[PDB]
Design a protein around this nucleic acid. Structure first.
Lengths: 73, 56
DNA sequence: ATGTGGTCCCGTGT
DNA sequence: TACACGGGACCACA
């Protein structure tokens, strides 16, 4: 079940056991969690804390807004 | 075991759930970069942002 | 009702 | 072997 959102699209959850939305991407629906390797998780959680952000997703937003130049290329 | 890492705030998990807003954008980077696993997109994003990380 | 962050168990693959 | 990734289910919460 598709639903439009700022910058992309979202799929409503199908089963009753979990009501987590997935996001639509270039390779189809995708779950919203992501595992990070240990090395990466250590450096990622640093930055997060150096920004004093509670939630990791807010540090991924920062990182993206901060690599915008790169990304767009 | 091993799914936690030692951070300045205590032990934290290596699997983290991105908000729909964030995931839409973050997966775009990973897909654009053509990386198989999303952790590698984070290594990039991080490295492509040292300049700022270095401040504060 | 329906989303949320976040974590546990486990199947599978490096 | 040991470690890794990610699907499914799940709790507390709003």
């Amino acid at each position: 079940e598709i639903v439009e959102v700022q910058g992309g699209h979202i799929i409503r959850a199908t089963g009753r056991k979990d009501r987590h939305s997935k996001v639509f991407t270039s390779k189809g629906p995708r779950d919203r969690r992501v595992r990070l390797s240990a090395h990466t998780a250590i450096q990622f959680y640093d930055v997060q804390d150096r920004l004093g952000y509670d939630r990791p997703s807010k540090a991924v937003d920062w990182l993206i807004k901060k690599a915008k130049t790169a990304i767009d290329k | 075991r091993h799914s936690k890492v030692f951070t300045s705030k205590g032990p934290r998990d290596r699997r983290v759930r991105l908000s729909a807003h964030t995931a839409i954008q973050f997966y775009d980077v990973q897909d654009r970069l053509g990386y198989d696993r999303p952790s590698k997109a984070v290594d990039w994003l991080i490295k492509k942002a040292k300049t700022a990380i270095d401040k504060l």
